[PDB]
Amino acid sequence: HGYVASPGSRAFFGSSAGGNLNTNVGRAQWEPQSIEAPKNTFITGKLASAGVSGFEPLDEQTATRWHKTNITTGPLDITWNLTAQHRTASWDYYITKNGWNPNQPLDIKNFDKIASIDGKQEVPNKVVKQTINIPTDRKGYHVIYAVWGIGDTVNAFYQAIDVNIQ
Ligand SMILES: [Cu+2]
Numbered sequence: 001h002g003y004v005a006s007p008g009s010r011a012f013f014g015s016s017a018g019g020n021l022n023t024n025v026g027r028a029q030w031e032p033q034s035i036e037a038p039k040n041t042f043i044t045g046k047l048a049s050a051g052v053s054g055f056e057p058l059d060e061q062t063a064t065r066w067h068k069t070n071i072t073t074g075p076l077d078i079t080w081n082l083t084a085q086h087r088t089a090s091w092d093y094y095i096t097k098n099g100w101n102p103n104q105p106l107d108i109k110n111f112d113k114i115a116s117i118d119g120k121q122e123v124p125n126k127v128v129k130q131t132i133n134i135p136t137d138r139k140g141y142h143v144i145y146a147v148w149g150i151g152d153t154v155n156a157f158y159q160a161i162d163v164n165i166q
Contacts, residue, residue, distance in 0.1 A: 001033035002082035002157055004146050007069035009159040010048055010058055011035060021067040027054035033083040039149055039156045045105030047145060048160040063102040063141060068164035073136045080128040088119030090149035098137045111145060121151045138165050
């Protein structure tokens with residue numbers, strides 16, 4: 001169990017620690033760490049919730065629904081907080097393509113992978129800090145999809161992150 005705290009994930013922003021910057025986020029208000037589904041679950045319109053019961057409100061998609069963190073292109077620091085550390089296989093990061101439609105359901109086919117970090121089947125610390133590169137053809141509202149792949153289960157934790165790139 002874990003979430004991306006910086007830039008705050010869509011689920012994390014639904015919690016008090018995230019400032020309640022997103023409203024009406026279901027289970028994300030209290031447990032943004034709990035978005036767990038089998039690896040390689042990428043159902044269109046169910047990326048933000050990973051199809052998980054009680055997280056459905058996260059799947060709404062419009063240009064103005066969610067709070068964005070202002071960021072630049074180039075290096076971006078990602079910080080996870082893990083409420084329950086687990087042995088780890090992988091960390092994968094995707095971002096929406098230039099030209100994507102922020103008023104349509106999220107579809108993984110409209111993202112590129114932009115980073116992949118091997119977990120080496122070790123148990124990470126409670127705070128995990130990684131640096132990924134945001135490609136320079138992205139401007140404006142984009143969604144980063146951060147995926148923490150568990151080493152000793154068939155599951156992963158899924159974190160959609162709303163950013164405004166300038
Ligand atoms: Cu867990």
